[PDB]
Scaffold this active site. Structure first.
Site, short mmCIF file in Angstrom:
data_model
loop_
_atom_site.label_atom_id
_atom_site.label_comp_id
_atom_site.label_asym_id
_atom_site.label_seq_id
_atom_site.Cartn_x
_atom_site.Cartn_y
_atom_site.Cartn_z
N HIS A 97 100.40 9.90 62.18
CA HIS A 97 99.52 11.12 62.19
C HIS A 97 98.12 10.72 62.62
O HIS A 97 97.68 11.49 63.67
CB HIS A 97 99.51 11.63 60.85
N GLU A 148 96.85 11.80 66.39
CA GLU A 148 95.67 12.82 66.72
C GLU A 148 94.45 12.42 67.61
O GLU A 148 94.00 12.79 68.62
CB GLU A 148 95.17 13.23 65.34
N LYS A 169 95.98 12.16 71.20
CA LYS A 169 95.75 13.48 71.93
C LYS A 169 94.36 13.70 72.36
O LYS A 169 93.91 14.12 73.51
CB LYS A 169 96.10 14.56 70.79
N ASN A 170 93.28 13.34 71.72
CA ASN A 170 92.00 13.61 71.96
C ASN A 170 91.44 12.64 73.06
O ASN A 170 90.72 13.22 73.77
CB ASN A 170 90.81 13.44 70.71
C1 LIG Z 1 89.94 19.05 71.80
N1 LIG Z 1 89.87 18.55 70.37
C2 LIG Z 1 90.47 19.30 69.53
C3 LIG Z 1 89.88 20.32 68.98
C4 LIG Z 1 90.29 21.08 67.73
C5 LIG Z 1 89.44 21.99 67.19
C6 LIG Z 1 88.50 22.65 67.99
N2 LIG Z 1 87.79 23.79 67.63
C7 LIG Z 1 86.64 23.96 68.14
C8 LIG Z 1 86.48 23.41 69.28
N3 LIG Z 1 87.09 22.37 69.68
C9 LIG Z 1 88.17 22.07 69.12
C10 LIG Z 1 88.76 20.82 69.46
C11 LIG Z 1 88.96 17.47 70.16
O1 LIG Z 1 88.74 17.46 69.02
C12 LIG Z 1 88.31 16.76 71.13
C13 LIG Z 1 86.83 16.68 71.04
C14 LIG Z 1 85.78 16.08 71.72
C15 LIG Z 1 86.45 15.07 72.50
N4 LIG Z 1 85.72 14.46 73.56
C16 LIG Z 1 84.73 15.24 74.29
C17 LIG Z 1 85.40 15.82 75.58
C18 LIG Z 1 85.41 15.00 76.85
C19 LIG Z 1 85.85 15.54 77.82
C20 LIG Z 1 86.55 16.87 77.77
C21 LIG Z 1 86.44 17.65 76.69
C22 LIG Z 1 86.21 17.01 75.57
C23 LIG Z 1 85.50 13.27 73.05
O2 LIG Z 1 84.74 12.68 73.48
C24 LIG Z 1 86.29 12.58 71.99
C25 LIG Z 1 86.22 13.13 70.63
C26 LIG Z 1 87.39 12.41 69.83
C27 LIG Z 1 88.18 11.62 70.23
O3 LIG Z 1 88.97 11.20 69.38
C28 LIG Z 1 88.17 10.98 71.31
C29 LIG Z 1 87.10 11.72 72.12
O4 LIG Z 1 87.13 11.39 73.54
C30 LIG Z 1 88.00 15.08 72.72
C31 LIG Z 1 88.64 15.81 71.88
#
Ligand SMILES: CN(Cc1ccc2nccnc2c1)C(=O)c1ccc(N(Cc2ccccc2)C(=O)c2ccc(O)cc2O)cc1
Ligand SMILES: CC(C)c1ccc(COc2ccc(CC(=O)NCCN)cc2Cl)cc1
Ligand SMILES: [Cl-]
Ligand SMILES: [Cl-]
Ligand SMILES: [Cl-]
EC number: 2.7.11.2
Length: 344
Positions: free
Chosen positions: A226, A230, A233-234
């Protein structure tokens, strides 16, 4: 009825945290009677402790349909377990209809997470999204979900043992890298499907004490998956999206370090990062609630509770302009892996 009395009684007790040892010793079986006698006390304790906390919520929250719903579940589940306080552990039907009772309870509670999500939602539009509403939501949901994680752990341990190698949801021999690859394979699958480009994976291990040995631990691998899932994914979203007008897609690098007490798992991406200001909001249930591969609410905070649950943690730090590192910290030693239950 008796609900508020039972709540009253059992919320005088303290949930009893268990350790992995104690967890392992609980089916290594025929001491099912012992699981039964234990659980009929401890579930009501734990159910009640959180139920009381739900009651400390202001009426404007408590009176909402979503909360009133899950509260009705907790009441029924407690009642369900009540029936067995008199019953005798030597009647093999007493036992097997407790299993059914636990199974049924576990299904009853499935949708708690998007249910509370709906309460947060209503609350946001109905009273605002100020910092103080946000500390409060955070505070309550971190404890609640944590509570619930530990309730589930209990139910699952019981139902999975009393239908070697694996002990219920515990692998006493979890190969961390194995679990990493799996989570990655699965995130990539979805990442390919939605983006049509996925970063490669690179794993490095650092067994400090034993240069050679593969890193194994005692853990709950579904929990680990899990969390990893996650984070994959991010890191995938970020990697892909930050690079769509560019040719190379930098891999996602994961390192597994096994120290004298820490077992640490870092997932480093080159997704362009987040600035320091927006880092705390990523763990906020409220800010990550709203009316693909990610943008998908709660994975981070819940993943972090998962880590907290046996005295681990999960932290993110980012370099804006470069990418994000994410660290899951777990206890190396079974001895140190003790449930962490919300206070009360
Ligand atoms: C996209 N999600 C899920 C999520 C869930 C609920 C949300 N609710 C409101 C807004 N955003 C949400 C996002 C993320 O958490 C997330 C947030 C930030 C990042 N980003 C930034 C980013 C860069 C390029 C394009 C988009 C975003 C990160 O840097 C980032 C964050 C966490 C992580 O484990 C790895 C990452 O690389 C990557 C993922
Ligand atoms: C749906 C669930 C997750 C939910 C949604 C929303 C909330 C919000 O909870 C709040 C919001 C504001 C305050 C300030 C207050 O009343 N202070 C009193 C001054 N001493 C207290 C609480 Cl408990 C909790 C749980
Ligand atoms: Cl907590
Ligand atoms: Cl058990
Ligand atoms: Cl952090």
């Amino acid at each position: 009825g008796s609900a508020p009395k039972y709540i009253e009684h059992f919320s005088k007790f303290s949930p009893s945290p268990l350790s992995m040892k104690q967890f392992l010793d609980f089916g290594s079986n025929a001491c099912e009677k012992t699981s039964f006698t234990f659980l009929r006390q401890e579930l009501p304790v734990r159910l009640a402790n959180i139920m009381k906390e739900i009651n400390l919520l202001p009426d404007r929250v408590l009176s909402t349909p979503s909360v009133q719903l899950v509260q009705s579940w907790y009441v029924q589940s407690l009642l369900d377990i009540m029936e067995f306080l008199d019953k005798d552990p030597e009647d093999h039907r007493t036992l097997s209809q407790f299993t059914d009772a636990l199974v049924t309870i576990r299904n009853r509670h499935n949708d708690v997470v998007p249910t509370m999500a709906q309460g947060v939602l209503e609350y946001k539009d109905t009273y605002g999204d100020d910092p103080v509403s946000n500390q409060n939501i955070q505070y309550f949901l971190d404890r609640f979900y944590l509570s619930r994680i530990s309730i589930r752990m209990l139910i699952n341990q019981h139902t999975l043992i009393f239908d070697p190698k694996h002990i219920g949801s515990i692998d006493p021999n979890c190969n961390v890298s194995e679990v990493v690859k799996d989570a990655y394979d699965m995130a990539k699958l979805l990442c390919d499907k939605y983006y049509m480009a996925s970063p490669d994976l690179e794993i490095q291990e650092i067994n400090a004490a034993n240069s050679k040995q593969p890193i194994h631990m005692v853990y709950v691998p579904s929990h680990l998956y899990h969390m990893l899932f996650e984070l994959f994914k991010n890191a995938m979203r970020a990697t892909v999206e930050s690079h769509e007008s560019s040719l190379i897609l930098p891999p996602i690098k994961v390192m597994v370090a096994l120290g004298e007490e820490d077992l640490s798992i870092k997932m480093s991406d080159r997704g362009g990062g987040v600035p320091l200001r927006k880092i705390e909001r990523l763990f906020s249930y409220m800010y990550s609630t709203a009316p693909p591969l990610a943008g998908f609410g709660y994975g981070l905070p819940i993943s972090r509770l998962y880590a907290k649950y046996f005295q681990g943690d999960l932290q993110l730090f980012s370099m804006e302009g470069f990418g994000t590192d994410a660290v899951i910290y777990l206890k190396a030693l079974s001895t140190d892996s003790v449930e962490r239950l919300p206070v009360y």
